[PDB]
Design a protein around this ligand. Structure first.
Ligand SMILES: *[C@@H]1O[C@H](CO)[C@@H](O)[C@H](O)[C@H]1NC(C)=O
Ligand SMILES: *[C@@H]1O[C@H](CO)[C@@H](O)[C@H](O)[C@H]1NC(C)=O
Ligand SMILES: *[C@@H]1O[C@H](CO)[C@@H](O)[C@H](O)[C@H]1NC(C)=O
Lengths: 246, 43, 272, 191, 293, 246, 272, 43, 48
């Protein structure tokens, strides 16, 4: 009565057989901007169907020597569909997200993953140079990976100087291959401003890191992918102008 | 007592009265189904 | 909750169906297993206080923020000494402050000025707060030192240290030390992103100081800034950094030569 | 809030394998698994958690603790373990028959794959200083030892090496006192 | 080298100052009727007490010390910082500040902590340098830079140990350094001129200790031996000198035999034998050797 | 709602995931001696914490050619802890026991065990001699094995001349490796006298006998231990004198 | 009882059975023989006060506690001056305080700093209170002098002496100067017990002081600590010591050369 | 009067009101049988 | 120091010159057989 679930948003539906309870981030549901907290004057648009649905990204094979992956959510589905088209024409943006990460295997595989959101997940440069001219900084595809994603180099320090062990304070969930095969996190709009550009600022980022390695005996299946879907709950847009690319 | 300010501004005062509102379930149990204390978390 | 918690008397159970010690951690929740649903406890009333562990009592410490030099030479002198106001220069208050994402508070800056070898002669100073957009003074006798429509403090060296209260002056609703984004538009390079992570809503002007005189003063002063937080509110707690800081306004770490979060032991099967 | 303990903080370990406890099928009927101290202000496994840094900011702590283990093996792998807490006194116990006289919980590998050993407050005084030994052994808390109860049995064509993730948090009666500077940072470069 | 003991009990020097740079003079050992240590009760030596004012150690202290003139400021005795008072295997004392320690390795705390227990704790884990401070500490390490905080004075690091009360276990915030080679059983010694101590040298030697010290040099002419310290008061335990080519014994020393201060052997494969007993154990040896090329 | 359980006694707790219902011996809970049935005059002591907790014994590897093991419960934890120390100083003793036997394996192993209590489990000597001078009798470590335990020689006749097939009349429980991995039996104080010495008389004995052999394919785990914990419920002691060893 | 005691008029008795002057001392009790059950007294009303003899008026004296030197040389200098806080260094306040077993109070430490030959130049000092567990500063320009999450006082030499209030900070319920026991476990020696009587619940950190400057200051300061007790409660009164103190943290006395509690007389049958 | 404190803490004040509760019989007559004033202590 | 762990009474020589040590019934069963040892040490009572 609890390990089954069907999440339906718009014209999409996600069915599962082995699931834990859904994680609601900070106890707050995604809601529309109230008139007291608002600061713009132009009326915002609310498509409510074409931008509120489960967009499925690509799958990534989880090998034995894998380190992990991360995304930037107001940047991943920024070029795909009506949400991206509506976000390229407008200047202001505000929405929540529903998350779902699929990873199934047999009852003979072992391993565990950690999927969590990190608000304001700034990527750190890797180097030992303090001069301003040679201090290493991450590239644009490292900061904003896009719909593909980026890999970790030192996932022990979250590629940010912050230890992974303390990253359980964020809204997180485990994917233990002996217990479940999916993880679901609902996250509201977390920002210090009511509206913000969905192109020059990623609010938070999803991270999948295998802490327990994938292990199996010789003879079983060897292709274990990680699939992720994203639902932009309660989308709002404002400041209509020409469409920009980036 | 408690060093009230002598100014027209309100940010130039000292620390006001304390507030013991913890509400720690927003970080420890951020789930939708209220897990009972004496039960299995998964059925 | 003025105290911590009380323990009710417990007893033993011998029955099936009730398992409080099997809290599944795959759900992302914290185990809610108490003492009374476990080993037999007694009745204790706890009077230990929880007042000191609050945010307002945790951030009401001054600490050092900035050090400003003032050479005031004779032939290659400068006269003034500007210092942009930022708290990411000394890793103590920065490490204490960077365990949250969004903060909002008021400040109680205190200025302590001494001499090079250590001495307090009665020279009068002038501390000036230049907001962003106001022109910076160039010279010890510049036009900007008139302080019209500009706050300034006149104090001597023998006087007690000055102390002014600074309100919350960010254009946004709160401060933030982590801005995952870009301040401008257009195309961004891939080799050197010197504009990534630049906190836009954090610049708070430049602090300035000179010596009020006519000709010069053969002295080398060195003032220190102590900022106390008050009326503080924090959001979205972040894990505490475990790597040594390397840059001023960029979180970086050494890829090689990584520091572990804990020290080493001889064996795993040994507590000492 | 639960946070991963670093029990495998010894050498011969990289960053990710530093947070895991290996579980295999022992040939001897009873063996000792990983063990660690309780005091969260002491250099060791409690240094990688958030409660350890919070208690390193302050100087005196009280209240009970919680250590929640988690089994990340296969589905067909079963077994039982003995997690045991012991108040101060003698040294770490040599065998299980000495260690099971304290506070212990028998743990199984079932559908629910996490047990939470609670560490009761068994101090003589009201507050303990977060300080290591020398002459300060007066404020020690004890040793948490993890023992093999029955075995790690596994069917064929299945890997026989699992891992247990250890997590730790605080209770409702946990309280702190006098604040100070931490000892995680002493030197700093001119930024 | 003048001190072959961990506390400087056998120090016969002529330093009549507390320190050579900025010190106060020591009082004579015959002008001290006020204090319970003088030559009027201890004739014929007893630690070394004549008509001088030298820095001795008659009371079994952690360091040599003399009587300073009391300037109505309390202290009437100060430790003498002797630069040439260090057993070979004692690197000196250094400072200890914080999170980067001088010795990057494992640590251990104990309620009984002598020098040899920490040396054995660091040696059983294959470390190069030992170290201890504040009486209860054991810092192991292999790093070549342990002076990153500076070198401190030897008078500052004279806090007493816990298992023994005649050995200096560093001080509060000051670590004392030692090599892991001292007090062991055996070692492939191929240096030019080293020192060989008995097993468990700062402590008393254990019962049933027997080991093999092998001395090999890359082509020296002959070797020169010496015996600075030798104190065994039993007829069972004994030291031997062996040849490893055809297994013949060169010399057989015993507790009832006074060994010569020096002799010569025209060999380069010297073997040392040491059979302990189970009845009486008092003190070991401090054999110093030198190879002539 | 029934295959999970957490037994907490004193400062100990036993968690499980695959369990049957607890077995209550003869429908009687362990209770304190009533004043009507008592015969001593001195006031008995009741520690209620330090002697009422789960003491864990050693583990025993269950091989393929295993026959079984047995213990004597007022003798196993007779030298370990406050219960043993309190039982060596006193002359009278009365308590109940809570039992728990752990044996987990994978879903590919097969086999079944039989754990049961036998009141007054007297060990029989093995031999065909009727002369009083050569009639074989068991030794002290065979009658009272201690905290280690003893093995069976002829577990088909329970090493007592009584068939194992009829031993289902005792309070028993099965450990079937396809159904559960633990067994729990709560037993009250069964004796014909109110109080009795806990050194010269064992009330009953636990027995673990594998009737279905352990079988597995080549490649799986090979170390299958048997772990047992004991809780002395409702302990009472009387007749305080000097401490005796045995 | 705001006054001492009043005397009721008495008279003579000539009768058998009532003996008030035969109080047996074998019972461990004090003789309760008053004046009215004895020689004939008068009616006096006493207005003498008993306010000064209370514990709160007996322990509200400052007295000297510690003397801290600060050489601040040029080549063999130290810069800082730590001093562990303990009151068993000066036998006056120790003798006054060691007539009870368990005490509990608050402190009003006052710091008086002077120069060697005697002079008050306007040099600024920094008094730091390092609690047990915090790192001790090593050097006059060390990292610990930032005083973040650490109480400190900045005062000059020409200023009046500083005065701070210290609360009751023992981990136990009260203080105790007599601990008949051992701090650790295990085997204890018989030759030299340097760990016997070591008061565990009495260490209160280390007090530190330096001079706020850049290079140095050729001066030798010497500060004195005066601790005033207030809000004091005493338990289990102990007899007052009659032997001269010999050690800092160990009650010892000379076996030979014993001091009598009273002086000598010529004869026992002579009052002079 | 009496120099009331101006602080949030309570230990930073001066001496509070006096307390004349002597109760000296806990040291002078620590016996169980209440010895009368006009009687013999032993019968 | 071994014998005083049982039931004992401190006795004085005063004006009253008789003490009465009572021997409590500390048996495990209800009745004891009036029989000496051998195999009948099961019914022994103790030592005064
Ligand atoms: C120390 O002894 C030497 C003799 O070698 C003598 O010249 C010198 O004056 C002595 N100094 C003192 C301070 O006794
Ligand atoms: C002590 O010995 C020295 C060295 O000979 C001598 O000069 C001095 O007079 C002696 N003192 C006495 C009191 O004999
Ligand atoms: C050993 O040889 C050296 C020179 O080779 C000589 O000086 C020394 O006296 C010799 N020792 C003996 C005991 O002959």
């Amino acid at each position: 009565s609890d390990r089954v679930a069907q999440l339906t948003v718009g014209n999409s539906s996600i069915t599962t057989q082995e699931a834990a309870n859904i994680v609601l981030a900070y106890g707050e549901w995604p809601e529309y901007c109230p008139d007291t907290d608002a600061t713009a004057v132009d009326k915002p648009t609310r498509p409510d169907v074409s931008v509120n649905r489960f967009y499925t990204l690509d799958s990534k094979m989880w090998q034995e020597n894998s380190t992990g992956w991360y995304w930037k959510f107001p940047d991943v589905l920024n070029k795909t569909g009506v949400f991206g088209q509506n976000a390229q024409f407008h200047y202001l943006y505000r929405s929540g997200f529903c998350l779902h990460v699929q990873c199934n295997a047999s009852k003979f595989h072992q391993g565990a993953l950690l999927v969590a959101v990190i608000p304001e997940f700034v990527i750190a440069g890797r180097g030992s140079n303090t001069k301003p001219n040679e201090a290493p900084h991450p590239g644009f595809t490292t900061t904003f990976p896009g719909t593909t994603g980026a890999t970790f180099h030192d996932p022990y320090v979250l590629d940010s100087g912050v230890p992974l062990s303390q990253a359980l304070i964020y809204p997180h969930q485990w994917i233990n291959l002996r217990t479940n095969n999916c993880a679901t996190v609902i996250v509201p709009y977390i920002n210090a401003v009511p509206f913000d550009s969905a192109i020059n600022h990623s609010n938070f980022g999803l991270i999948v890191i295998p802490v327990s390695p994938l292990k199996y005996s010789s003879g079983a299946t060897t292709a274990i992918p990680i699939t992720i879907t994203i639902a932009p709950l309660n989308s709002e847009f404002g400041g209509l102008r020409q469409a920009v690319s980036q | 007592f408690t060093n009230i300010n002598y100014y027209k501004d309100s940010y130039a005062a000292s620390a006001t009265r304390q507030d013991f509102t913890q509400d720690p379930k927003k970080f420890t149990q951020p789930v939708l189904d209220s897990i009972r204390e004496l039960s299995a978390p998964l059925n | 909750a003025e105290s911590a918690a009380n323990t009710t008397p417990s007893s033993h159970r011998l029955e099936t169906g009730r398992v409080p010690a099997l809290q599944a951690a795959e759900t992302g929740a914290t185990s809610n297993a108490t003492d009374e649903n476990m080993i037999e406890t007694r009745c204790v009333v706890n009077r230990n206080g929880v007042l000191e562990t609050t945010i307002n009592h945790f951030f009401s410490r001054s600490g050092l923020v900035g050090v400003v030099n003032l050479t005031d030479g004779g032939t290659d002198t400068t006269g003034y000494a500007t210092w942009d106001i930022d708290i990411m220069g000394f890793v103590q208050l920065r490490r204490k402050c960077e365990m949250f994402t969004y903060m909002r508070f008021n400040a109680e800056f205190t200025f302590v000025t001494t001499t090079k070898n250590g001495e307090a002669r009665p020279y009068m100073l002038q501390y000036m707060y230049v907001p962003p957009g106001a022109p910076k003074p160039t010279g010890r006798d510049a036009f900007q030192w008139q302080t019209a429509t500009n706050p300034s403090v006149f104090v001597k060296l023998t006087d007690p240290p000055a102390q002014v209260s600074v309100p919350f002056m960010s254009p946004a609703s709160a401060y933030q030390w982590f801005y995952d984004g870009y301040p401008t538009f257009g195309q961004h390079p891939e080799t050197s992103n010197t504009t990534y992570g630049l906190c836009p809503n954090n610049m708070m002007g430049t602090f300035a100081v000179r010596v009020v005189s006519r000709e010069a003063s053969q002295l080398k002063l060195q003032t220190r800034v102590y900022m106390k937080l008050k009326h503080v509110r924090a959001w979205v707690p972040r894990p505490i950094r475990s790597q040594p800081y390397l840059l001023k306004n960029f979180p970086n770490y050494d890829s090689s030569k990584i520091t572990n979060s804990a020290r080493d032991r001889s064996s795993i099967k040994q507590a000492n | 809030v639960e946070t991963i303990l670093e029990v495998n903080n010894t050498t011969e370990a990289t960053g990710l394998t530093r947070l895991l406890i290996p579980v295999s099928s022992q040939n001897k009927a009873d063996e000792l698994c990983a063990a660690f101290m309780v005091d969260p202000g002491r250099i060791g496994p409690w240094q990688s958690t958030l409660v350890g840094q919070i208690c390193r900011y302050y100087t005196q702590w009280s209240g009970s603790l919680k250590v929640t283990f988690m089994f990340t093996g296969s589905f067909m792998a079963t077994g039982k373990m003995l997690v045991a807490y012991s108040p101060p006194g003698s040294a770490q116990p040599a065998n299980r028959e000495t260690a099971m006289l304290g506070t212990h919980v028998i743990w199984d590998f079932g559908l629910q794959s996490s047990v939470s050993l609670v560490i009761p407050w068994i101090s003589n005084t009201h507050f303990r200083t977060a300080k290591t030994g020398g002459n300060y052994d007066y404020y020690t808390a004890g040793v948490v030892t993890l023992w093999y109860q029955t075995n790690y049995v596994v069917p064929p064509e299945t890997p026989g090496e699992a891992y247990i993730i250890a997590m730790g948090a605080a209770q409702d009666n946990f309280t702190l006192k006098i604040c100070k500077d931490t000892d995680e940072v002493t030197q700093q470069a001119v930024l | 080298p003048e001190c072959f003991t961990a506390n400087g009990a056998d120090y016969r020097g002529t330093q009549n100052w507390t320190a050579l740079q900025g010190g106060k003079p020591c009082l004579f050992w015959n002008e001290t009727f006020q204090h319970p240590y003088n030559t009027l009760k201890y004739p014929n030596g007893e630690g070394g007490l004549g008509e001088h004012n030298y820095c001795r150690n008659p009371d079994g202290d952690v360091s040599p010390w003399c009587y300073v003139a009391e300037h109505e400021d309390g202290v009437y005795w100060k430790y003498c910082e002797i630069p040439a008072c260090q057993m070979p295997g004692n690197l000196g004392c250094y400072k200890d500040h914080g999170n980067p320690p001088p010795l990057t390795g494992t640590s251990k705390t104990s309620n009984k902590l002598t020098i040899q227990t920490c040396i054995s704790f660091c040696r059983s884990q294959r470390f190069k340098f030992a170290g201890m401070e504040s009486g209860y500490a054991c810092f192991c390490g292999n790093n070549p830079d342990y002076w990153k905080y500076g070198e401190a004075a030897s008078t500052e690091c004279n806090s007493v140990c816990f298992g023994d009360h005649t050995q200096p276990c560093g001080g509060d915030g000051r670590i004392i350094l030692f090599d892991t080679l001292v007090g062991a059983c055996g070692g492939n010694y191929s240096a030019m001129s080293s020192v060989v101590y008995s097993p468990d040298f700062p402590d008393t030697y254990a019962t049933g200790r027997v080991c093999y010290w092998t001395i090999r040099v890359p082509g020296a002419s002959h070797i020169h031996f010496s015996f600075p310290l030798f104190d065994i008061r039993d007829s069972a335990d004994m030291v031997e000198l062996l040849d490893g080519y055809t297994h013949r014994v060169l010399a057989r020393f015993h507790g009832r035999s006074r060994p010569p201060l020096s002799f010569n052997v025209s060999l380069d494969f010297v073997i040392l034998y040491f059979f302990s007993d189970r009845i009486n154990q008092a003190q070991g040896f401090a054999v110093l050797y030198q190879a002539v090329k």
